[PDB]
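FAQ
Q: What does a multi-component entry look like?
A: The components come first, one per line:
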Amino acid sequence: KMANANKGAMTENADENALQSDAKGKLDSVATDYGAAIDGFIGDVSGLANGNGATGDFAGSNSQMAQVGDGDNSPLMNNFRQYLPSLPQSVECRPFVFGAGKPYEFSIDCDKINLFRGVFAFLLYVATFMYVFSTFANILRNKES
Amino acid sequence: KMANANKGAMTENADENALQSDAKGKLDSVATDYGAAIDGFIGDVSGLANGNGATGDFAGSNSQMAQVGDGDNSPLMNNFRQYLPSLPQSVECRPFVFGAGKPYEFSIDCDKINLFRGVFAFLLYVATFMYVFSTFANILRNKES
Amino acid sequence: KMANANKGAMTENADENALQSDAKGKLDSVATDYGAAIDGFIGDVSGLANGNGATGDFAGSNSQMAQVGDGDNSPLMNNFRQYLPSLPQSVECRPFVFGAGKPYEFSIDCDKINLFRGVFAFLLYVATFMYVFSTFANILRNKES
Amino acid sequence: KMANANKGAMTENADENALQSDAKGKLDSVATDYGAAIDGFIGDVSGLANGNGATGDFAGSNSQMAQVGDGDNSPLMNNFRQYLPSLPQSVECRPFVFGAGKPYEFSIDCDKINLFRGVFAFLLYVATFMYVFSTFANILRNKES
Amino acid sequence: KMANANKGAMTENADENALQSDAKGKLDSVATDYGAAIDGFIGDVSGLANGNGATGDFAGSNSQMAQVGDGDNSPLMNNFRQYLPSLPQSVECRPFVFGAGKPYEFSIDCDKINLFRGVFAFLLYVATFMYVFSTFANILRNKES
Amino acid sequence: PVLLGIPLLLRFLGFLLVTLFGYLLTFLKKGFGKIAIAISLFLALIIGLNSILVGYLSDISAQLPSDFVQGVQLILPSNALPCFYVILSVKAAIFIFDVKQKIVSYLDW
Amino acid sequence: PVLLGIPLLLRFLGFLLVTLFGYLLTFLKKGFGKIAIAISLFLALIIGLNSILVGYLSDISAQLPSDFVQGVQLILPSNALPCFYVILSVKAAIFIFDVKQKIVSYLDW
Amino acid sequence: PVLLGIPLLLRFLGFLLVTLFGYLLTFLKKGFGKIAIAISLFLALIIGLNSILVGYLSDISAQLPSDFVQGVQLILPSNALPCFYVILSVKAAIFIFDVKQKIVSYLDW
Amino acid sequence: PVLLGIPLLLRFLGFLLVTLFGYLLTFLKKGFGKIAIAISLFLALIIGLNSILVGYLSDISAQLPSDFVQGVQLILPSNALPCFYVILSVKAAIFIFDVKQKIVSYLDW
Amino acid sequence: PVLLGIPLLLRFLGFLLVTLFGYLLTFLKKGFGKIAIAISLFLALIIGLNSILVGYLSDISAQLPSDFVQGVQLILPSNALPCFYVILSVKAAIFIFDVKQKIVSYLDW
Amino acid sequence: DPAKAAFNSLQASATEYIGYAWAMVVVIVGATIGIKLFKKFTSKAS
Amino acid sequence: AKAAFNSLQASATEYIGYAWAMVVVIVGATIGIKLFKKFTSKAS
Amino acid sequence: DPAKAAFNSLQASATEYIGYAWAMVVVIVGATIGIKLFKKFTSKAS
Amino acid sequence: DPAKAAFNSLQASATEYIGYAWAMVVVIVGATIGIKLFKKFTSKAS
Amino acid sequence: DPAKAAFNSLQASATEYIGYAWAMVVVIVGATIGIKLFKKFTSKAS
Amino acid sequence: AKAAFNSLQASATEYIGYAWAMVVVIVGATIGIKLFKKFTSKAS
Amino acid sequence: DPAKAAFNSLQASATEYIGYAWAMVVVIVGATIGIKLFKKFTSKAS
Amino acid sequence: DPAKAAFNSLQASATEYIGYAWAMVVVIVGATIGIKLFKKFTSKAS
Amino acid sequence: AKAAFNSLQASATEYIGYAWAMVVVIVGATIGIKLFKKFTSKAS
Amino acid sequence: DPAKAAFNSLQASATEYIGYAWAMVVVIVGATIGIKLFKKFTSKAS
Amino acid sequence: DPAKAAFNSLQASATEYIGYAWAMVVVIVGATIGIKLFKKFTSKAS
Amino acid sequence: AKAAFNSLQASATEYIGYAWAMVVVIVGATIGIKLFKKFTSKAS
Amino acid sequence: DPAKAAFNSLQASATEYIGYAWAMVVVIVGATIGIKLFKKFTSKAS
Amino acid sequence: DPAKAAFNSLQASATEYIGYAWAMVVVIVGATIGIKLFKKFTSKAS
Amino acid sequence: AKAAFNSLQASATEYIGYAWAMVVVIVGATIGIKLFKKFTSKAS
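Then the predicted structure of the entire assembly, as tokens:
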């Protein structure tokens, strides 16, 4: 059988289950690194956004995001509080006396000042409430709030 | 015929209709998963947008989108209604009497108060109508409305 | 010539001009569908934009775009016209008579009312012209107009 | 040497420097068209932007971009100039005479009118200068200017 | 052994470690250029942004970015300073004398002018502080600041 | 004049390329359908908002009383209502211009 | 009627294509998960801002005194509170419209 | 010194690559045509809006009466009309700057 | 049971695929580094602007005189300073909300 | 120990990959050049607008008369001009901050 | 008594004056409202 | 004597009647002008 | 004593004059307040 | 009795004086109202 | 003394007038505040 | 003589009593009208 | 000398009149200032 | 009668004053309108 | 007697004629100044 | 008859007084109008 | 002389009135400034 | 004769002294009320 | 002639009265102007 | 005649008053303009 | 007789001269105060 001799001369025993397994193993061992990198980027950006934190390339922005602050306490904003103008603290009403000790001595009875103080407080609330309501209603709109 | 023997020694019977069918079957069985994933993402985002609902990864945003609300009833906005300032309810006009029982007793006839109330109602409408018209006209513009 | 016999045993006559032609024919017959789909999408979106119309997936938005309107006649905007507040129509000036028939009978001569009406018309124009000019000048800016 | 005969029977003389050269030549002859198309698109858009001009698909927008104008002379804007309201041209001050020829004849000395005209000119400048300064400072902000 | 002769006739000694090494060497020698180009673009844009500088294609924008300026000293903005309107420099208060030398000679005591100057300075601060605070609070919002 | 299996290999390569490019075509059509769905949702949201806004104006409607008509007619020039209608027409034109520009911008998806 | 190794080569090519396309599918699912995470974060930020804003209004609350009620009732027409409520309803409708439009725009990721 | 079919296989591979890259070139040209169409539509919309806006101003036109001219000339400084024209020129310059910036931004499509 | 060179060809194909996919991984990591650099630059610019703005307020500082205190205390209700502080807190909350939303939007790069 | 033509086929495959990846590199460099051109055009437009705006202010220039100086000096506090200059400096800082942020955003092209 | 007749005549004259004044003030108020409405439209538009 | 006083008293009352008839007209005119000016000013 | 009766009569006349004057001034002030309030309310409304 | 005729003559003179005064005051008040209304309307218009 | 009694009566009358005036001014102030609040809402909305 | 002076003084004081009783009413009415007008004007 | 005592009595009467007038004017001016300040504060508040 | 002649002369003088006042008020009104228009332009621009 | 009364009546009327001719000028000047001030104030 | 000449002399004196008064009032009213117009124009300008 | 003493007393009284008026006007001015500042904050916020 | 004139002159000056002492008080009260009203109005 | 000396004495008294009145009116007008300017400046400042 | 001299003296005094008033009104106008300019800057900024 | 009338006429004119010299000063002071108040009010 010369056919058998020629076939044996130019033939190498190759197994599909070996070559396929090796190729798939290498491809998986690198695709796992690919997926790990993608998931790491996603986790870093999410942690920066929600305050959990970031590791790796984004670790340097942790200090900056902590300086920005969360909730309503912004350390970047609190710098302006040191220069905030000083304003008087509201106290009880004291009547003002004109010409004290003289025959023309009259004083503001301060009974109507309290009524004015009540209506002023009401107006200040209605203004602040409307401001906050419009502030929340126009968050997606690129407008000052 | 040594030619025939050598040809038979180094030949394997392979059918195109088998290899092509197998490859196409595997490729289709995975491309259907690809298309199903794409369509599922599309359906989830559309359901979140129009209020139908989402399943899978976006199922967690169903609660948030239900809290946002649809139409004009926003449960996120209705929180402010509890703190809404109280305002008097409009009633019929009552004349005001100055110095009741005295020789200088005069009262506001309240006949012109009704005319003023009518013109005030007209002005309040023209303001609200213009506000709503401009609100709808400037929806795509990033402006408060 | 055993060489010739062995060569004939393991040789099949294949023509480049046939395999190349078949492959190119199939690839072109599918790439024409690709290009047709791209051009159809482009035409549909352009027709929706400029009012020519769309066919296929975008055919459902034809009704919505017709409802939006073109030029300045918006059927979506014309809904507000039904609730437009009624305002008096401008007519010629009629003098107002005080105390008609009495010894103290004086009337507004309405000669200066026409001069005021002219200057008022001029002011209303200069306001509307400036509004329209600024409206057109700030179309790309995301501002109310 | 049967080995030599069999080797000669199933061997064709192929040169690497020919097949490689042919493939690279075809690929370069089509990649040059690719690069030419990319550069043509870039040049067309740049010419439309800076007023140099465009050729090819973008040639149709040359008329539109010329109609828009460059510098500050916009033919689209100059259409409004025809309807611009007419305003008086500033001239020298003429005193106004009350009761000319009568014993109660007094006239505005127009000495203080010139001082008022100077301060008015100053105020108009400070307003226009501030407007232009804020206009340039808020070009990237989507605000009216 | 004719099998050995036929095997030797149609066999060339090829080493995997040579072909693999050559292919990987060429691919790496071009991928290093790819990565260098990407990193060069990144560095150029970052240097333009933070004022470090750019080299290559972006080198032409170095002059423009230097003209824009950094910090708060903008050479583009300093052009307006030459045309800035001239305003008086604040000095100490000088009383104004009416009818000097006449029996009706009275002068503004300028004691209350200093109190008004203090309260005016306070109001100007509270306005400027609020303006700066809102300016910083609305930097991401597309609003004038 | 070639060994056996070369034409079969070439046919297999062509078949693979055709199948892959057909998959690409199917995915492209899916993307176009996604764009159409997005446009439809956007326009539907606008229409619904319009419907809600038009409904509110029925309740609060009010009219100018019979009085005050004489004074308004006394002062009203010939170009007041035309100016008001011009303003309304400008508002409508800008609205539809914005809508059409958004539709144009949907070409980048 | 082909030489040995051709069917094995074709099977290897098919296996390579299947593995690569499966990797592509996995990456696509990762991207969809990223989009879902982004939407969740955006909505959570809105809800947190709302919670903070609602809390501030408790402290500064104040009411109109018993006086000034007579005058307000003297002048107040029948359509003042309806107009105020219409304005508030318009504010809420525009807010939810903006939120839904942003959700729609998330289709381009 | 190679077996039969290798040069034919290499030629087939080169032909496949050339055909695929030509398809890519055709699709690139299609995309460029799409960008040109978008730019044309955007500019046409602007021009149409301008045409409509210019037309409205003819009807409502009015002029300052013969009176009130004396007072305006009495007070008007030398730099009032120049300031008004400077404001109009600034408006036009900003408009064309915005248009050109949008054209520049069309480079990202 | 296959001819010589088929296993070597398959190994070469696998090696080529592995090398190309590794190059893709390296480029992906480069892109992620670019995104991190962009975020860092954006936050640094915000911090620098804040530093400059805080510095200006030192020079122009002024205080309300000793007078006018009596009247302000005479009129000032109990909820004026709380309202002012609520406004400032709302400003700060909106600022940090905008910053966090921009950070979230950086997920699309 | 392999048949003839296998090494030549492998060399051809490597050559094809190298040529294709070189084409990709060339296209990447073309894209970077496009980005640089866009940035240059944007900055040039800003500079030209500035030049036009600075020129208009020469004509309409005017000065406060010799009078009214006494009153202004009578009332002017020590921190009026500092406040005006602080406002101008804030305007300039915000302008350059916006320009730099746009330059940063050009990293996404 | 002439005094009461004169006082009643004065009161009647005052009433007539009041009626005429009410009519004229209503007209002038309408004019003022019209002016403000038709200027507010354009002003708020811009 | 008594008749003279009666005549003087009668003549006095006759003159008072005329003085009242005059002063009513004068005062009515004055008050009319005053109220006219006041109300025309108040209404405008 | 006629003087006492005369003084009483003049006092009664003065009282009736005061009554008439009070009526007239009440009418006038009421009209003035009504007109003023109408003008103020309309001015504040628009 | 000349006194009655004299009183009648003075009454007639007073009546004609009242007529002339009424004419003049009507003219003056009309002019004042016209000027005031013109100024008010112009002030509200701009 | 009649003078002091008259002065005390005048003071009491003034006090009554002051009380009534305070009531009426409170009512009118409430009306003004209501008008401004319900116009400010719509005006600020737009 | 002295009785006449005493009677005149008494009658004078009686008349003063009546004059005061009249002027108090007149002045009260005048001041009432003045204050009424002033306060109704101030309150509105 | 009765004239000196009469002058002293008139001076004392004038002084008591001045005291009563001062009391009344203080009351009136206090009420006026209170009303005016209330109106001003409310007008500025809204 | 001199009285009617004097009254007519006064009426004519008043008419002349009214005409001159109308002219001057028209001039001043024009000036006010010009000032407001040329300040409103710049103010609304910014 | 009668001639004296006639002369006195004539002289009286002559003086009335002169008094009227004076008062017309005085009143005209006063009213002119008043109206001038009033209208120059109203117009401005 | 000295009375006629005396009346003429008083009339001439009154006429010259009227002339002087007219001159002075013209000066005063001109200054007042100038100041008022300056204040109004400046107030409207800023 | 009594006249100069009375004039000096009047001047001293005027000076006292001026001092008290200055104090009260300072207080009222402070109140007005406070009202405007605390309303401007909220108003400008919205 | 001369003594009577001297007494009358003295009594006259005594009364002038009293009239001045009265008018100073009256005028002071009037001016005080006027200035009080004026300044309380101006300050508010 | 005592009349001439009496006239001179009355003239001197009038002159000293004028001097005192000038001093007092200067003080009063200065205070009024100061208060008015303070109120105006504060009102314009806020 | 003393009358014309007195009238001329009064006119000269009025002219001096007018000059001083013009100077003072110019100063006060400058102050008002300064206040409005330096408040408008900050107000328009925000 | 005639000399007495001449002396009375002369004395009368002398007194008129003094009355005018007084009234000019008084009227000048009054008008000065009035104009001072008016112009200081108008200027501020």
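Q: Is there any commentary attached?
A: Sometimes. For this entry: Chains W and A do not touch (no CB pair under 8 Å).
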